[PDB]
């Protein structure tokens, strides 16, 4: 149980965050410099999005040990060889994705430990702390430990994942079955005046992570792509994953609080303040910090109050397709944003994107704080 | 009555459409080449917008002969002198605006003749034919007649307007009073679920003329700014003003028809087809043609069914502030569109704007054709 999680998730984050610098490294050493890394962040949500959603139906059947760990891992063997020459050739693509793939395993991780929540007063921090912690240190002395962690990433991912496998010895029981007859799709046909209500919260996370996809591009962009800083980009990002998570515990209760939006609101705005605040460090590095913060408590109140109602099918739809969808939108904009960002400097343009989402959450924040009705 | 209109409106369109080429001429001979002419179109809606709206309250008091004709005309004396050196210096600005100012007089023109409508089966073509016709020919042999119509425009505007004055001998009677205590401002607070209804039509003309502001930029842009073609841009645009107007008579009844949107829908889309259709002429020249078409029947069903309900204050708000407002939005985009259109060629970018409004009206078209409820 518990330990099976710690192992599979360990490799999950190891490959995940480590691919952040790894991307930075090889991606800034390939064909499409820095436009691609922004796109890589888009890939982050590509994985998680289709995961929680479609992998949801996949979660209800079988396939954990086989497809999930055994599958993605063997593909990782193809990893360094093909990912050198083909590193450039969309193999920087395959690599990045698979890292977050183990992260998908992490998704299921939050699920079962939630059962453990039913045992007492636990809320979410527990499982997330498990992952978060392993991420921060292991990752830092990983690349930061001895430069290009080629066979090291090979070890971390393979070794930790197969460690899980070797001690997991389980397919996936205690849950339903059939993905082919599970995939959902519906609409606001039933969600009519719910527009006032549901669309209030819709606009919330929808716009939130969407513009945040663009902001993700920014924050994770800054660096000297290989370097200790990028290896430690994996580190720093994770260090902050940890602080905001217990903060997210009380933060879920805060989600109630002036709609956690008050949080997101002021935060993204402050991100911009730091964007033009002090000497290098704090600015965008804090940017990534905040982004993840928002993500967690948001997905917290959303997880429960969303997925348990008939808005289970409609719920999968709201946080997953809606949010992840917005992310995809901004990502596409990025594709042509670079190709059209030719305005050499480019101030107010990308800044309009970043700042937009910040202040966008501002207006949405208070505006939603006002409405309140039961059923 | 009738003749007073024909005179004041005559000068109205003379200065109006003639400023279209005149702009093209001097504007393409000034500081901000061609970005400014696009902006000039934005000025078109600046005038008409604030006119129908705020000039509405102005219409209810007094000021026709004094402020309206006497005022704007004397300002026109300042016209060629200051508008040469200062032509460049925002005097190309003052000139263009004042032309459409006499056009404001035209606004009041559609009003009274509507009373004449109450007399039988008339709908709108009548007054609009008056203006439209005078525009097309007078304008063509105006600039096209003997090149730079300096003192000619002086004559046309001054002479025709003062002709009106000399035979108008009326201030403005048969209507209410007080602008200072007339200016309206309110919101969708009352217009709640009206969102389904009102916002259906809202999106209609809102987006319609907004993107059309950008499209206006395109269509009226093409030319060799002085030239017979531009003088005849005034001509051509007006020639087509005439055809679509009686077409707008039956077109109002068509406004009903699959919501006149079916019209706007297919049309703007076809505008794009011609954009990449045949040899020079037909393309964007047809572009302007269609734009005005849409404008008239739209403002027709809107005029009646809009301005006569409590949505008189709310009505002024919908077609006037809402539509005109959208126009302003696109115009601003234009300001920085040029400054950022530095992508030397610039295909899909401005084309995305043009094409967007076309297809935008497509979706809105059919989508609205479906709803139907009384009260």
Cβ B216 vs Cβ B291: under 8 Å: yes
Write the CA distances from A266 to A76, A214, A297, A363, B341, integer angstroms: 41, 18, 15, 10, 34
Number of domains in chain B: 1
Nearest to B162 by CA among B63, B74, B60: B74
Which residues, including other chains, have CB under 8 Å from residue A88's CB and lie 6 or more apart?
A26, A30, A31
CB-count burial class (<10 Å; 0-12, 13-18, 19+) for B233:
buried
Shortest Cα distance, chain A CAs vs residue B268, angstroms: 25
* Alpha-carbon span A321 to A203, nearest angstrom: 13
Resolution of the coordinates, Å: 3.5
Taking the CA of residue B351 and the nearest CA in chain A, the distance in Å comes to: 14
> How is A159-218 classified by DSSP, letter by letter?
HHHHHHHHHH-----SS---STTT-----TTT-STHHHHHHHHHHHHHHHHHHHHHHHHH
Q: Report how far residue A269's alpha carbon sits from residue A272's, in angstroms, rounded to the nearest whole number.
A: 5
Q: How far is CA B240 from the centre of its chain?
A: 14
Contacts of B340 in chain A (CB under 8 A): 343, 349
Among B168, B160, B167, CA closest to B138: B160
Q: Exposed, middle or buried by CB within 10 Å (0-12, 13-18, 19+), for A4?
A: buried
d(CA B288, CA B219) in angstroms, rounded, equals: 5
SS3 sequence, chain B? Answer: CHHHHHHHHHHHHHHHHHHHHHHHHHHCCCCCCCHHHHHHHHHHHHHHHHHHHHHHHHHCCCCHHHHHHHHHHHHHHHHHHHHHHHHHHHHHHHHHHHHHHHHHHHHHHHHHHHHHHHCCCCCCHHHHHHHHHHHHHHHHHHHHHHCCCHHHHHHHHHHHHHHHHHHHCCCCCCCCCCCCCCCCCCCCCCCCCHHHHHHHHHHHHHHHHHHHHHHHHHHHHCCCCCHHHHHHHHHHHHHHHHCHHHHHHHHHHHHHCCCCHHHHHHHHHHHHHHHCCCCCCHHHHHHHHHHHHHHHHHHHHHHHHHHCCCCCHHHHHHHHHHHHHHHHHHHHHHHHHHHHCCCCCCCHHHHHHHHHHHHHHHHHHHHHHCCCCCC
Taking CA–CA distances from A193, the nearest residue in chain B reads B193
Taking an 8 Å Cβ-Cβ cutoff, which residues of chain A contact chain B? Answer: 193, 195, 340, 342-343, 349
From B112, B168, B210, B194, select the one nearest B371 (Cα to Cα).
Answer: B194
A193, A342, A349 member nearest B343 (Cβ): A342
Nearest CA in chain A to B342: A343
What's the number of CA atoms in the CB half-sphere (13 Å) around residue A271?
Answer: 32
Of the residues B338, B341, B342, the best mutation for testing chain A's interface (the one with the most A CB atoms within 10 Å of its CB) is B342
Cα(A104)–Cα(A52) distance, integer angstroms: 8
Residue B120, domain extent: 1-375
- Smallest Cβ distance to B343: which of A193, A195, A340? A340
| B347 to chain A: closest CA residue | A340
- A-B CB pairs within 8 A amount to 9
How many degrees, rounded to 5, is the angle at CA B212 between CA B210 and CA B217? Answer: 110
Query: Nearest-CA distance from A76 to chain B in Å?
Result: 40
Distance, CA of B332 to CA of B350 (rounded, Å): 14
A172 in Cβ contact with A8 (< 8 Å): no
Structure tokens at A88: 């450039």
Calculate how close chain A gets to B288, using CA atoms only, in Å.
29
Q: Which of A193, A195, A343 has the CB atom closest to B342's CB atom?
A: A343
Q: For chain A, first and last CA: distance in Å?
A: 39
Collect all residues with Cβ–Cβ distance below 8 Å to A180 and sequence separation of at least 6.
Answer: none
How far is A34 from B91, CA to CA, in rounded Å? 46
Pairwise CB contact (< 8 Å): B342 & A340? no
Other C-beta atoms closer than 10 Å to the C-beta of B276 total 8
The answer to whether A336 and A187 have CB atoms below 8 angstroms apart is no
Q: Six-digit token pair at A369? A: 């704080």
> For residue B200, what is the domain's CATH number?
1.20.1720.10
DSSP state of A53: I
> Do the beta carbons of residue B325 and residue B308 sit within 8 Å?
no
Query: Which element (helix H / strand E) includes A140?
Result: none
Exposed/middle/buried for residue A165 (C-beta within 10 Å: 0-12, 13-18, 19+): buried
**Are residues A301 and A252 in contact, defined by beta-carbon separation less than 8 angstroms?**
yes
CB B218 within 8 A of CB B284: yes
Sign of CA dihedral A161, A166, A167, A171: positive
Nearest to A284 by CA among A338, A237, A238, A218: A218
Element (H, E) at A11: helix A2-27
- Torsion, Cα A33 A38 A40 A44, to 10 degrees, reads 170
CB A349 to CB B340 under 8 A?
yes
Structural tokens at position B74: 């004397």
Which DSSP state fits A341? -
Q: DSSP letter string over A268-315?
A: HHHHHHHHTSSSSSHHHHHHHHHHHHHHHHHHHHHHHHHHTSSTTHHH
Q: Which residue has the tokens 């842009």?
A: B221
Supply angle C-alpha B241, B244, B247, rounded to 5: 150
Which residue in B343, B346, B367 has the most chain A C-beta atoms within 10 A of its own C-beta, making it the best mutation to test that interface?
Answer: B343
d(CA B9, CA B312): 26
Q: Which residues of B touch A349 (CB under 8 A)?
A: 340
CA–CA min distance B217, chain A (Å)? 21
Angle between helix B150-168 and B92-118 (nearest 10):
40
Contact flag B195-A195 (C-beta cutoff 8 Å) = yes
Characterise A49 by phi-psi region: left (phi > 0), alpha (psi -120 to 50), beta (else): alpha
How many whole angstroms separate alpha carbon A113 and alpha carbon A131? 12
Distance, CA of B317 to CA of B185 (rounded, Å): 7
Structure letter (DSSP) for residue A157: H
C-alpha–C-alpha distance, residues A274 and B116, integer Å: 65
Is there a contact between B349 and A340 if contact means CB atoms under 8 Å apart? yes
Q: Are B201 and B368 in contact (CB under 8 A)?
A: yes
Evaluate whether B231 touches B114 at the Cβ level (below 8 Å). Answer: no
Is A193 close to B195, i.e. CB distance below 8 A?
no
CA distance B118 to B97: 33
A46: closest CA of chain B, how far (Å): 26
């Amino acid at each position: 149980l518990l330990l099976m999680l710690v192992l599979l998730v360990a490799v999950g984050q190891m490959a995940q965050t480590i691919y952040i610098p790894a991307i930075a490294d090889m991606a800034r050493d390939l064909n499409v410099r820095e436009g691609a890394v922004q796109s890589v962040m888009g890939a982050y949500l590509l994985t998680y999005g289709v995961s929680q959603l479609f992998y949801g139906p996949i979660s209800d059947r079988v396939g954990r040990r086989p497809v999930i760990l055994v599958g993605m891992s063997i593909f990782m063997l193809a990893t360094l060889v093909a990912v050198t020459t083909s590193s450039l050739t969309v193999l920087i693509a395959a690599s990045a994705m698979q890292g977050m793939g183990t992260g998908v395993g992490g998704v299921m991780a939050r699920t079962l430990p939630r059962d453990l929540y039913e045992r007492t007063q636990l809320r979410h921090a527990n499982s997330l702390l498990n992952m978060g912690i392993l991420v921060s240190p292991l990752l830092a002395p990983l690349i930061g430990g001895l430069l290009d962690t080629m066979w090291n990433w090979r070890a971390c991912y393979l070794f930790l994942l197969v460690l899980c496998a070797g001690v997991t010895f389980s397919m996936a029981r205690w849950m339903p079955e059939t993905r082919p007859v599970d995939a959902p799709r519906t609409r606001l046909l039933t969600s009519y005046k719910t527009l006032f209500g549901n669309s209030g919260f819709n606009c919330y996370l929808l716009m939130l992570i969407g513009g945040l996809a663009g902001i993700a591009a920014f924050e994770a962009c800054s660096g000297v792509l290989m370097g200790a800083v990028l290896g430690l980009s994996s580190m720093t990002v994770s260090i902050l994953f940890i602080l905001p998570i217990p903060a997210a515990f009380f933060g879920a209760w805060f989600a109630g609080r002036p709609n956690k939006r008050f949080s997101t609101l002021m935060w993204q705005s402050v991100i911009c303040c730091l964007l033009a605040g002090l000497l290098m460090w704090i600015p965008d590095w804090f940017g990534v910090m905040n982004v993840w913060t928002l993500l967690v408590p948001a997905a917290l109140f959303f997880f429960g109050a969303g997925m348990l109602f008939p808005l289970a099918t409609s719920g999968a739809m709201e946080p997953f397709p809606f949010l992840a969808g917005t992310a995809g939108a901004l990502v596409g904009g990025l594709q042509n944003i670079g190709s059209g960002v030719l305005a050499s400097l480019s101030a107010m343009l990308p800044q309009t994107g970043q700042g937009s989402l910040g202040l966008l959450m501002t207006l949405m924040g208070l505006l939603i704080v006002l409405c309140w009705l039961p059923l």
